[PDB]
Amino acid sequence: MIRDIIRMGDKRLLRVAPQVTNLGSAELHALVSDMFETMGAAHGVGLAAPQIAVDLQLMVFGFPAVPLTALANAQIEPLSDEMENGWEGCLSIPGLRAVIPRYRYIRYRGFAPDGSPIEREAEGFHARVVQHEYDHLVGRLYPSRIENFDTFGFDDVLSY
């Protein structure tokens, strides 16, 4: 079941989400399946539960190949201070994109929907997706991270 994605301006994207506590359950499995379908229909590479107005620490991502992943109760830590600039957009901000700095190298930990633990090092684009989705879980959107406002604009127009 494809879910409506809420758009920037909705207060529900500004919340700090609570932890998932129904790992291995049918209800979580149905939510995650809905999230992959929703992401798929929207042509995304990530989707966070607050974007479909579900207040939980849950994201799905994947597609430089990023493994298809469902991640609950995510924790992230940089593995160096090295930042890298790259293009981001957001399903809740359709048509736009900007250049955003992120950590080039991270580790992320949490749980798969069946309750097994996940722990991975990631770099580049893989790492960026995860940081971007993690931001949704703490009520943060990418415009609050732009440094160079010349890069912010509509996808079909931008020539940076």
Ligand X SMILES: O=C(CSC(=O)[C@H](Cc1ccccc1)CC(F)(F)F)c1ccccc1
Residues acting as catalytic residues: 133
Which two three-digit tokens encode residue 53? Answer: 């107005």
Please report whether residue 132 would count as binding ligand X according to CB under 6 A.
Answer: yes
Please report whether residue 90 would count as binding Ni ion according to CB under 5 A.
Answer: yes
Gap between the Cα atoms of 105 and 102, Å rounded: 9
- Pick 20 or 129: Cβ nearer ligand X: 129
Among 13, 45, 56, 106, binds ligand X (CB under 6 A): 45
| Backbone conformation region of residue 124, classed left if phi is above 0, alpha if psi is from -120 to 50, else beta | left
Instruction: Provide CB contacts within 8 A for 149, sequence distance 6+.
Output: none
Parallel, antiparallel, or unpaired: how do β-strands 83-88 and 58-61 relate?
unpaired
Q: How many residues bind ligand X (CB under 6 A)?
A: 17
Task: Reduce the DSSP state of residue 59 to 3 states and report it.
Answer: strand
Q: Is 126 annotated as a binding residue?
A: no
Please report whether residue 50 would count as binding ligand X according to CB under 6 A.
Answer: no
Q: Which stretch binds ligand X (CB under 6 A): 17-25, 37-45, 70-78, 116-124?
A: 37-45
Interacting residues toward ligand X by CB under 6 A: 43-48, 51, 88-92, 128-129, 132-133, 136
